[PDB]
Design a protein around this ligand. Sequence first.
Ligand SMILES: N[C@@H](CCC(=O)N[C@@H](CS)C(=O)NCC(=O)O)C(=O)O
Ligand SMILES: N[C@@H](CCC(=O)N[C@@H](CS)C(=O)NCC(=O)O)C(=O)O
Ligand SMILES: N[C@@H](CCC(=O)N[C@@H](CS)C(=O)NCC(=O)O)C(=O)O
Ligand SMILES: N[C@@H](CCC(=O)N[C@@H](CS)C(=O)NCC(=O)O)C(=O)O
Ligand code: FES
Lengths: 115, 101, 107, 111
Amino acid sequence: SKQELDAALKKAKELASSAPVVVFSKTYCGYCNRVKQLLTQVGASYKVVELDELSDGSQLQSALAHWTGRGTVPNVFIGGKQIGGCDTVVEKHQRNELLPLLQDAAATAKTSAQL
Amino acid sequence: DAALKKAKELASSAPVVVFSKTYCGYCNRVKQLLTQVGASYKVVELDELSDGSQLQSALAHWTGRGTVPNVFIGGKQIGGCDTVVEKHQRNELLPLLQDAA
Amino acid sequence: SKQELDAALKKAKELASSAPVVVFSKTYCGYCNRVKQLLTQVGASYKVVELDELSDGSQLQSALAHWTGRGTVPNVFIGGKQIGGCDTVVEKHQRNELLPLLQDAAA
Amino acid sequence: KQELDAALKKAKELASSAPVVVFSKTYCGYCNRVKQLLTQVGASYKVVELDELSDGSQLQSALAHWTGRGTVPNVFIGGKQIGGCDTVVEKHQRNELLPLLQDAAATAKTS
Ligand SMILES: N[C@@H](CCC(=O)N[C@@H](CS)C(=O)NCC(=O)O)C(=O)O
Ligand SMILES: N[C@@H](CCC(=O)N[C@@H](CS)C(=O)NCC(=O)O)C(=O)O
Ligand SMILES: N[C@@H](CCC(=O)N[C@@H](CS)C(=O)NCC(=O)O)C(=O)O
Ligand SMILES: N[C@@H](CCC(=O)N[C@@H](CS)C(=O)NCC(=O)O)C(=O)O
Ligand code: FES
């Protein structure tokens, strides 16, 4: 469990930074679909990690719980930074804060320093 | 951190501690099971607390479980509804409870 | 097996009218919980049917889809009349239309 | 009662308006998956994005009354009901999908 708890945490962290936007999700969840709706509405591209379609989904989820303090889906990352869940994303949209998050993350990622 | 301290204190404040939400069917199931078998337990309903989401987040950080119920016996992490139900079917729950009492 | 579907429709109709407020639900669903929480906070009493806990749950949902136009959960009935899902109840309540319905399923 | 009868009629018309019709929502992962699969196997398909239509909700509700399916995608081949993303994917795994598409391709319009 030890070298394998480190493994799952390692894998979750990689996934979380693996795309400009990353949504940890379950295929059956409407809260997850609402986040997807809000991202699509703002014209963002994003990666979805459906945890229930992964054999290590369970372990990835508890790694996310330990790391982020959010053990529920959706668990949203923008530019590798923890955003929050569905309530969070709805709030960012409602206050017009979702677009700047996306654009600021993209600006940071564009043509980064080699050193 | 404040929430992490409160959560740990809470989890140890009785022989059995169930972190819960009033609307949760899985919490109801554990609660029903625990009282069937005659156990006394403390319940902390997170949805009735101002700091409830911080407390839940502390529990995720500490236990790796981000959902309710989150069940403790003798200050030790047991798990959720499924964990408790399935232990009890395979006779592992009454020992633990008796030991903690 | 249109008769597993007639049986499910029958069982569904009986369920829906078995209490003044009925919530077809799944135990794990946050949208279902949002409705349960709201009904409790307004002081209503409800019965819940957790479809994920029944062996004929999927058949009841098709029945509900065929019958009501809604195959998703939550599916909320007041006084035996289909009201809608989480969004509907929350919007109705925000327009003070939820309370009158709840009162009549008592009065 | 007049409104319910019309939306059912429109649903049924759209369902048969192309050799393959996918009732969809733009953000839905199952819809994305079903569209990628149909593309993969060379299907000619028309997508109806319910969230892009003001009567999307009534259309979805018509689809549920009629098909008993309350979710997107809702897929039709040759005017006939197939089901959702899981159903189409299972057809494909059974190699039943290409033959259904070839059947529907016998004539340009659905008979
Ligand atoms: N407040 C959270 C609620 C998220 C939530 O309740 N997620 C549920 C599903 S609807 C969940 O993850 N349950 C455990 C699981 O499905 O793994 C948010 O806004 O994202
Ligand atoms: N498999 C879990 C299911 C628990 C679960 O899904 N709980 C829901 C409440 S119904 C939850 O905590 N959802 C996220 C939330 O309410 O914050 C267990 O056996 O305990
Ligand atoms: N707009 C609906 C959302 C309902 C929804 O998306 N429900 C999901 C679960 S969180 C569902 O029933 N999915 C299909 C299924 O479980 O069979 C509402 O407001 O109630
Ligand atoms: N098992 C179904 C699942 C489809 C599904 O869950 N769709 C979600 C959208 S991603 C849905 O329709 N939710 C209710 C709604 O959008 O009204 C299939 O394979 O097609
Ligand atoms: S499941 Fe229904 S909301 Fe997550």
